[PDB]
Design a protein around this nucleic acid. Structure first.
Ligand SMILES: [Mg+2]
Ligand SMILES: [Mg+2]
Ligand SMILES: [Mg+2]
Ligand SMILES: [Mg+2]
Ligand SMILES: [Mg+2]
Ligand SMILES: [Mg+2]
Ligand SMILES: [Mg+2]
Ligand SMILES: [Mg+2]
Ligand SMILES: [Mg+2]
Ligand SMILES: [Mg+2]
Ligand SMILES: [Mg+2]
Ligand SMILES: [Mg+2]
Lengths: 169, 294, 21, 159
RNA sequence: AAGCUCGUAUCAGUUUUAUGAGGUAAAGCGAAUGAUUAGAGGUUCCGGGGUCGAAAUGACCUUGACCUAUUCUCAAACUUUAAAUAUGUAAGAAGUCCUUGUUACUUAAUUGAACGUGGACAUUUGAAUGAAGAGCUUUUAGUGGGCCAUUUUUGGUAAGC
RNA sequence: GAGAACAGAAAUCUCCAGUAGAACAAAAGGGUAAAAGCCCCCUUGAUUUUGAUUUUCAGUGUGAAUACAAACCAUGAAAGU
RNA sequence: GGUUGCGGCCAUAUCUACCAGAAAGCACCGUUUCCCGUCCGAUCAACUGUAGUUAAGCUGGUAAGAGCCUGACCGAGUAGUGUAGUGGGUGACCAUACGCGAAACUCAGGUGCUGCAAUCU
């Protein structure tokens, strides 16, 4: 039936792939903590490509995870920017999804020219409760087949709440 | 389609033993535990194992043999009502109580209880059960925490303190007990004594009760129902300790039924296997119906 | 590479590729 | 040029098994070894410490020493025109009782019990074993089993 | 060569019984690695294209790839499996059982360990066959270019290599 | 494999599959999955005293290695190492 | 018989897709003052056992299921091989005598057992 299989948000991950190290990386870092109330983390580049101008381990991007009520309200504050209007092919085949935006100042931080103007990529991890089965240490196990998330489940949920719409396909 | 693993893969798969599949026992731990100095031929190594399940605590004394492991004695949490404890059967003090119980139980059944009395005037101090002069050189046993993660003040080490204060000689340092100062290497005996006697809940009563009555109601509801005051909490633990030191004899339950009755009910209740003749008839019928043009 | 992979608008690539002052 | 290391030409000898890699089941360490036990040697490639040299692969000897985690063994090696006794030190992993004695003692105890119970009536217990005696005379009937006649087979290519 | 200590044995280029170890012969590739011929079915938001098209995450053919099930053939430095022949150990008195002495070792513990005291069990005392005696010590001559035959086998076309 | 702005065959993030098809200084071969792999914390047992044993072997040496003994240590809660 | 803790043997115990599961137990499950760790009480820490649910985990069954295990005069006394001849053949190689003896293949059957301790309509 449907006693407690209710879908819910795990985590909002906030990503910025600023292509270079140094000051503009530092400023990128100084963007998120205001938005997140939370300190960010920096990821290194794991092999040179020499066309994007990157070396091994020269620390390119910044991303954060947020969960719970603060995560859902910030999600809402992003979907307001995107006017509740998302394309089907954005959705993961597992039931995850995500999108991107530009001009982070179009929400929250006014301009603060010392910081600059940056775009982000939000990505949402979605599931049902009872998920710690795959995450605890003792007696680790996988989730049942019927109990996973799906394209259809997540799009239907996204329909019914936020009363939003999905595009062409 | 995608969720399809090849026949070759299935036929070359290795399997973990059984407990690794179940994610239950760390054989790398069991290695360092159960091996005996080969010069000491049959003298078995004894493990005080501790396990924390939801709403219950288990502690046991085990030696190991080829045909299986064998247990000297066991101590569950859920019989502490026999010793005057009715709530919070998973708190760190509950673990201490269980350790004390198992300690005195084993010593009583082994005939060591008169000697190695243990410690009565508990003070949160760190000391080992030293060997009595020219005596029987007290019993020795080592921890077995399983996969449970070690960390400062973890409630398993309450069981360690229970065994130690009971009198078992259990080799251990103290730098993980709650209140082990970190930036400087000392221990706060009185804070430890607080966690022994339920400080973290006795104190926690006050802020919540003077702060948030509905929250103080939903949890600790049983405390209100059975009329326990915060200050009195230390008293019941102290009285328990004497109750254990009085009688650890492990009265077992009476089961109000029979082994056979339980087996019969579950047997008649359970679903059964299907036999080969019926399997053949089943496939034949499936042919004659679905394949047989319905 | 695809046949039409990044093919821009004439009036949108002017603010895309200028690469010098 | 030529080459003779400590572990040369062991590439197959020391491979573990098929489908048996990984840690070792505890029974091996749960064994207990007394001085005077007769023991076989089979190397175990998983534990590089205290291995036996390839020459002592598959051999059999008598234990003579016991230490915290290993065993002293005596082997007789044929070098030149004599035998020399070598003493080995092996971790308990490459070691297992040769149940030859395990069964032999069974025979001995059963033998003594048989001797005693036979002496209880003085009836010449007759201890020694015998090789396979030639089988005895016997009669074969044909009831419902009439002899069946064969014949050699002709030839064809069978393809 | 000189002997020495003893007199049917603590033996044996041997078989049997019991129990180990091995990766060669063989075999396998619709089993890992690697090689290899052929069609068959799908699959391109994705290869190269052409045809219909202004393009389309539009259609048709083509080539290629990729995947699926099949098919033909191989390995000294591949392998699931796995021989015969060769090979380790045991088949008793230096044994087995019973009782209880010693220790600074070890055990929670007279528990264990090791060595003993004392007692019990003989020619069927622990498979086969043989045993021309068995065991032990010195000391010193010659020798340190080899060759051939069956079988296994390496380089080379081969050779009386 | 499936998704996320610039971002594309390749940057960063997330999920699913994953018996090792990777890594382990170097040649190859063994061995390794709550590790022998990757990351983090503490340290110097890469110490002292001389023996015993294995490999090449004359049962010499050298090299390398193994198992104890007697101290002082490091680590871990601990067994251990 | 069910369940839990500790196991032995390490797939007859794994994998793929479905279906059922009383009681208890296990579990998911609620909270962040304190010990404690995190980019984030997700993991780990602590407290309650109170607010709920067997949906999942787990157990069992189901499949002319993959796999896996066992057996067989199924293949085969074949392949291979120890020993012998003044045996055959120019040779490559092959029969013969006394011996040992595979794998693939085919068919049939099977799909965890079990020790210690506690608890369960
Ligand atoms: Mg560990
Ligand atoms: Mg082998
Ligand atoms: Mg070879
Ligand atoms: Mg061949
Ligand atoms: Mg083959
Ligand atoms: Mg191959
Ligand atoms: Mg042999
Ligand atoms: Mg001379
Ligand atoms: Mg010469
Ligand atoms: Mg580790
Ligand atoms: Mg040497
Ligand atoms: Mg001849």
């Amino acid at each position: 039936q449907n006693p407690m299989r209710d879908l819910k948000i795990e985590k909002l991950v906030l990503n910025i792939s600023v292509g270079e190290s140094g000051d503009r990386l530092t400023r990128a870092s100084k963007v998120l903590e205001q938005l997140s109330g939370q300190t960010p983390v920096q990821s290194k580049a794991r092999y040179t490509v020499r066309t994007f101008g990157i070396r091994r381990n020269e620390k390119i991007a910044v991303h954060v995870t947020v969960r719970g009520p603060k995560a859902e309200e910030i999600l809402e504050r992003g979907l307001k920017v995107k006017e509740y209007q998302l394309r089907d092919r954005n959705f993961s085949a597992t039931g995850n999804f995500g999108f991107g935006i530009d001009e982070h100042i179009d929400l929250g931080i006014k301009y603060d020219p010392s910081i600059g103007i940056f775009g982000m990529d939000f990505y949402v991890v979605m599931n049902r409760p009872g998920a710690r089965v795959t995450r605890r240490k003792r007696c680790k196990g996988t989730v049942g087949n019927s109990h996973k998330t799906t394209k259809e489940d997540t799009v239907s949920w996204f329909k019914q709440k936020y009363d939003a719409d999905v595009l062409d396909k | 389609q995608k969720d399809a693993k090849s026949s070759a893969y299935s036929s070359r798969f290795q399997t973990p033993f059984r407990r690794r599949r179940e994610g239950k026992t760390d054989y790398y731990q069991r290695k360092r535990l159960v091996t005996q100095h080969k010069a000491k031929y049959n003298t078995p190594k004894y493990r005080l194992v501790v396990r924390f399940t939801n709403k219950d605590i288990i502690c046991q004394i085990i030696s190991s043999t080829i045909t299986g492991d064998v247990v000297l004695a066991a101590a569950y949490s859920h019989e502490l009502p026999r010793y005057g404890i009715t709530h919070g059967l998973t708190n760190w003090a509950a673990a201490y109580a269980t350790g004390l119980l198992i300690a005195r139980r084993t010593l009583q059944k082994l005939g060591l209880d008169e000697t190695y009395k243990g410690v009565e005037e508990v003070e949160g101090e760190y000391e080992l059960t030293e060997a009595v002069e020219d005596g029987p050189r007290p019993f020795k046993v080592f921890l077995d925490i399983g996969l449970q993660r070690t960390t400062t003040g973890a409630r398993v080490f309450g069981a360690l303190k229970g065994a130690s204060d009971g009198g078992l000689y259990v080799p251990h340092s103290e730098n993980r007990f709650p209140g082990w100062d970190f930036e400087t290497e000392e221990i706060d005996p009185e804070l430890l004594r607080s966690y022994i006697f339920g400080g973290h809940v006795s104190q926690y009563m006050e802020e919540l009760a003077d702060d948030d009555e509905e929250r103080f109601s939903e949890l600790f509801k049983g405390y209100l129902a059975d009329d326990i005051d915060a200050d009195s909490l230390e008293d019941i633990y102290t009285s328990a300790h004497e109750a254990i030191r009085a009688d650890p004899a492990f009265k077992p339950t009476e089961k109000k039924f029979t082994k056979e009755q339980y087996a019969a009910e579950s047997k008649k209740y359970r679903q059964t296997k299907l036999s080969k003749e019926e399997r053949a008839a089943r496939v034949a019928a499936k042919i004659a119906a679905l394949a047989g043009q319905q | 590479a695809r046949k039409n992979r990044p093919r821009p608008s004439g009036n949108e690539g002017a603010i895309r590729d200028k690469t010098a002052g | 040029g030529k080459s003779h290391g400590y572990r040369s030409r062991t590439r197959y000898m020391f491979q573990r098994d098929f489908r048996k890699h990984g840690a070792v089941h505890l029974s091996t360490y749960l064994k207990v070894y007394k001085v005077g036990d007769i023991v076989d040697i089979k190397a175990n490639g998983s534990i590089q410490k205290g291995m036996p040299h390839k020459f002592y692969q598959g051999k059999t000897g008598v234990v003579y020493n016991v230490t915290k985690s290993s065993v002293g063994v005596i082997i007789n090696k044929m070098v030149g025109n004599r035998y020399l006794e070598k003493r080995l030190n092996l971790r308990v992993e490459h070691i297992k009782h040769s149940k030859c004695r395990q069964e032999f003692l069974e025979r001995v105890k059963a033998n003594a019990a048989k001797r005693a119970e036979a002496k209880a009536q003085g009836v010449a217990v007759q201890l020694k074993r015998q090789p396979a005696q030639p089988r005895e005379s016997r009669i074969v009937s044909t009831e419902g089993n009439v002899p069946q006649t064969l014949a050699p087979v002709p030839y064809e290519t069978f393809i």
